[PDB]
Amino acid sequence: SAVKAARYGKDNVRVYKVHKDEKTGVQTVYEMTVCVLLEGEIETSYTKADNSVIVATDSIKNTIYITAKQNPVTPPELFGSILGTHFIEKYNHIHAAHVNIVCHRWTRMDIDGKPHPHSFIRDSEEKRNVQVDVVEGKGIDIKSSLSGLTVLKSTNSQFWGFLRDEYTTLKETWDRILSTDVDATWQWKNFSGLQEVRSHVPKFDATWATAREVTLKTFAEDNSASVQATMYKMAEQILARQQLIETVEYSLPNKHYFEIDLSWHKGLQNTGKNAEVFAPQSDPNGLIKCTVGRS
Amino acid sequence: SAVKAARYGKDNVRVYKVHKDEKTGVQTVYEMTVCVLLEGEIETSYTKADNSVIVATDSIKNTIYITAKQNPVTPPELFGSILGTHFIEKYNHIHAAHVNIVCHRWTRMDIDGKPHPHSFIRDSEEKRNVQVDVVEGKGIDIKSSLSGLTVLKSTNSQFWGFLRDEYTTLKETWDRILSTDVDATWQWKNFSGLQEVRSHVPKFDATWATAREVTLKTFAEDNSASVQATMYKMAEQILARQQLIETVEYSLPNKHYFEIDLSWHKGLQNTGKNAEVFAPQSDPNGLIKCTVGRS
Amino acid sequence: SAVKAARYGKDNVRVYKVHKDEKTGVQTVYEMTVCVLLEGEIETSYTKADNSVIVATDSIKNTIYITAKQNPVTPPELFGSILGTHFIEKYNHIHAAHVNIVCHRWTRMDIDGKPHPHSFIRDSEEKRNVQVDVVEGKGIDIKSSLSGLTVLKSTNSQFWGFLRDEYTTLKETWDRILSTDVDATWQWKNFSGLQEVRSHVPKFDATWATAREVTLKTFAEDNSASVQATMYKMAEQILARQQLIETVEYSLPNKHYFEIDLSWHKGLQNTGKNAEVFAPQSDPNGLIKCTVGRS
Amino acid sequence: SAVKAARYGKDNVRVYKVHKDEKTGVQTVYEMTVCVLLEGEIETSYTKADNSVIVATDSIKNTIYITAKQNPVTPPELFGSILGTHFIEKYNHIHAAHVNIVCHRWTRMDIDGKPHPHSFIRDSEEKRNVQVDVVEGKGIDIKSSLSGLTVLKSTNSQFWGFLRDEYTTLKETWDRILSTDVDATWQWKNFSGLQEVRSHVPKFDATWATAREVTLKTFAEDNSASVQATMYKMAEQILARQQLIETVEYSLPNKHYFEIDLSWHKGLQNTGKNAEVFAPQSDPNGLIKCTVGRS
Ligand SMILES: O=c1[nH]c(=O)c2nn[nH]c2[nH]1
Ligand SMILES: O=c1[nH]c(=O)c2nn[nH]c2[nH]1
Numbered sequence A, B, C, D: 001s002a003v004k005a006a007r008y009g010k011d012n013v014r015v016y017k018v019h020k021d022e023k024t025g026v027q028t029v030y031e032m033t034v035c036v037l038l039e040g041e042i043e044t045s046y047t048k049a050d051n052s053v054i055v056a057t058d059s060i061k062n063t064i065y066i067t068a069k070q071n072p073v074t075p076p077e078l079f080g081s082i083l084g085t086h087f088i089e090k091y092n093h094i095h096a097a098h099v100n101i102v103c104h105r106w107t108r109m110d111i112d113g114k115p116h117p118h119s120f121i122r123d124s125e126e127k128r129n130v131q132v133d134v135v136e137g138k139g140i141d142i143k144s145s146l147s148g149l150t151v152l153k154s155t156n157s158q159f160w161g162f163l164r165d166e167y168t169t170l171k172e173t174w175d176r177i178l179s180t181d182v183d184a185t186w187q188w189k190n191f192s193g194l195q196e197v198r199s200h201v202p203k204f205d206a207t208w209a210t211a212r213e214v215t216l217k218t219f220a221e222d223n224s225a226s227v228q229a230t231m232y233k234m235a236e237q238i239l240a241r242q243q244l245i246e247t248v249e250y251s252l253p254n255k256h257y258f259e260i261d262l263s264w265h266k267g268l269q270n271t272g273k274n275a276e277v278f279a280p281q282s283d284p285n286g287l288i289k290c291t292v293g294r295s
């Protein structure tokens, strides 16, 4: 037998950082969950019980805190790139670092119409994520995403004209509820190293904001022919607005809401044009994916 | 042996309702999870296999959908009271109904600065809940609550002057992070029946809004001596603003964020006044409760 | 306003303890999650910011570890009683302690047909729990339970003869699947104090074992007329076998498995006597409760 | 823009099947959660709103139930291969099917030392899984796994001799607790089609049993130098026992249990050789992965 692939590190490292403006008294908080996995010349830890090649996962944890102390943690694309680069530069035998960051929302409270200097609310479990792969001699690959963005529209969704055969019971419809949890990922062109990532810092927050805005507007305004058609429109627009993105991937559940026929009860009308009360279905769910790139 | 207490019914009934304004084209959605448990002269179903006394839980489910079709589902205090009353009026041998409703957020989207007519976002997993106990000959008892409101302040929280003995290691502090998930419940005076609940309909949404506003403002503005002292200030204000409330109960976890001593690493200063990076603790957590009533 | 009720403490305290037999080399592990909430003369911490009356929740945490170091942690009824008594004896102004313990399964591995001395497996998320209320001058009240015991029988369950009216669509059945997650609680007679709890130590594990055995056997062997009738048979037997129990409470979801009509597809027969493939329903679910006591 | 990749289908399809032996009266149940995603000539559903190429996800759901009605559902490797093959054979424009199956445990109850004919218990949330990729013209690729197998050993684990630098605080140890949740995957050699999968049917259950047995025995008996070294020993043995496996992958969290220094309290000794009470850590956790193949 031989080791074909190996990686190891620390997962689920929760980190909070506060920035305090001495002039204004305004404080800003960041909270993330971080995972770092390393690869390199470590096969002998598996095959020969040679621990000398192991940077202990506990040390990886310490390194995350130290790096957060000495560097900006925003945008997460930058922090992830700093953190990954550290490991390949510090340890001769480590040749790749894989950094995943999940950013949790702490949104400044408005109290009596004014932004509060040091109080925050978790407005939704929507996350902003990054995956950063730092590979020695191959640069820095960054995938940015938003996830857990849950939306619903109560009309202006259709689904007709699909294949009908002996396995089909679904009725065509020209008016249905459409609800999903949005997972959207944009992959940046490969960066040569940290200097290049630094050069593009302003683009990271702006592209996240654009991706979110395009997602919401397209969902709200499209008279949707299918999840497939609406998601493609989203991806097309993001690629048009940021030339440094190579691909956009969407993964969308179709969270079904079923009509309830109540006609058995005193002829009550609750289907089609008369439908008011529906039964949300926890499972199963459609799952629709697509990756869109450039011609 | 004897049956000392019994209740049964249907839990986890998901319900969605849409309201469509024909004039404006504006649609409004409501989504809830409902539980209904019944009590009454049903002992023989347990002791003698006498199913004749059982309103099937499946029928309870149907009743929830039918009731939602024929009645307003908002405010939930009203819907719960209608639903509970139905069972005690319809079935001679049923003498109490216990209705729990959890309301999920579907907040209208703003697209380009204007409210969208039929598109919604789940902005946080904060819930608005009601528990309604309808007891034949004893009226309607309603407990309203908000839950899952997660907040954090990065300063203006203190904790000193507590009991110190041989079990104590905690250091006194004049500046710490305070974070919690708010669970707040206000109990209404007993209502004589549905007519009285209807008479107070406007008070339900207004009191929820007040409870939420008082919670947020007090949390943000109090230079907190402890969770105990801050929560009492919240409860006091709610009772002052709504005379039909008899008690207010808060249940608050103290979600700890620990300083990380980094001085072992090149004398890095990250404690006390120099603290920037902290470790959020998933467990354990303080849990502080209080019920406040009138003199 | 006035404080009507207050309690506070530490939740979610994870504790592991190992016992090592020097003679045999056999090791035995216990893992629990503990919550302790205190009541007493603490109103002024809420109303006056008087922290002098507060035993810090951090100190409660330390006390749990110290108590586990110096005492047996099994049976949990005993450990809970020791822990609760500590607080009322140590602190003059604390008058009640409420201790909840959840015990996690670590079952010794059998390797090649022999019990391993120090290796364990988590065989299911079934828990053994205790709630212990130690109230000064009123003794020790203990509720023991098992929870998360998930079972299914594929036949020998019936449900017919229930009330039928204009809200009823459920068909009567003489053969259905019955599946539930068992939550069973037995409440002990009040104990005068720790000496009396110690005197009954052997009864605690034996009664848990009996409760579990009666639950499983009755479920498997009863040709069930309803969840109500089967659960009553369980409770009756437990009360018969342990005279120091005052009441038994069961809370049982009815986890539905629906027939799937496939007759639309080439006349495939999958209902009634021909039913082979079913659709488990995640929600909604029936919920059936009963508390059984002595004549 | 262009569609670079696309797949769609139905997720979270819960399925139960019962087998009834008419001769013996013995019943056997299977419960699974199934996901099926399709690929093929479907780009126009995304780019042109052409639904004619879409096999509706609802129809995929129906197909899963029909296929389960007409075929064995065990071993899951076979069922997955039947299900995947169906889609590529039935639909000209569908060229790949991706089938994921999670099998839930329903273990026959022993009542009074005898196996019960129709009563079952969920003994742990351990799963047996398969991923089957059926690709037209490229055969059938099957990855089998077990997951959610949670184990702990209280001694006979060591970790010393790792890299020490200015980021290291971890002390070397010759005796620690080791606990993990095992995720183990074995990848079969590519099969040419369904006939070949059928020819190897007996190997599937046998290899699962072997993988589980090797995992448990190795964990229990290895005086472990690290998670890395122990997991490699596991993978080596599985590859030795089944020649039709090409690779074995393990992914193991290191679930930490920390010593608690109690010496501040009356000199209580609870570290090193005196350690009895530990604090299980929910997060962070080490994460160690390896893929082992043949020389
Ligand atoms: O078994 C281990 N492997 C590791 O890589 C490691 N790092 N810290 N502790 C550890 N334990
Ligand atoms: O066992 C049952 N008890 C009930 O009360 C019920 N209601 N619907 N189905 C049921 N099954």
Ligand SMILES: O=c1[nH]c(=O)c2nn[nH]c2[nH]1
Binding pocket: B159, B170, B225, B226, B227, B228, B254, B286, C008, C054, C055, C056, C057, C058
């Ligand atoms: O606000 C607090 N209240 C308490 O009771 C406590 N105990 N430890 N820390 C604490 N903080």
Ligand SMILES: O=c1[nH]c(=O)c2nn[nH]c2[nH]1
Binding pocket: A159, A170, A225, A226, A227, A228, A254, A286, D008, D054, D055, D056, D057, D058
């Ligand atoms: O938008 C949809 N896309 C699909 O592929 C599908 N299949 N069933 N319903 C559906 N809705």
Ligand code: NA
Binding pocket: A087, A088, A089, A090, A091, A092, A093, A094, A095, A136
């Ligand atoms: Na390197």
Ligand code: NA
Binding pocket: B087, B088, B089, B090, B091, B092, B093, B094, B095, B136
């Ligand atoms: Na009545």
Ligand code: NA
Binding pocket: C087, C088, C089, C090, C091, C092, C093, C094, C095, C136
């Ligand atoms: Na006392």
Ligand code: NA
Binding pocket: D087, D088, D089, D090, D091, D092, D093, D094, D095, D136
């Ligand atoms: Na094909």
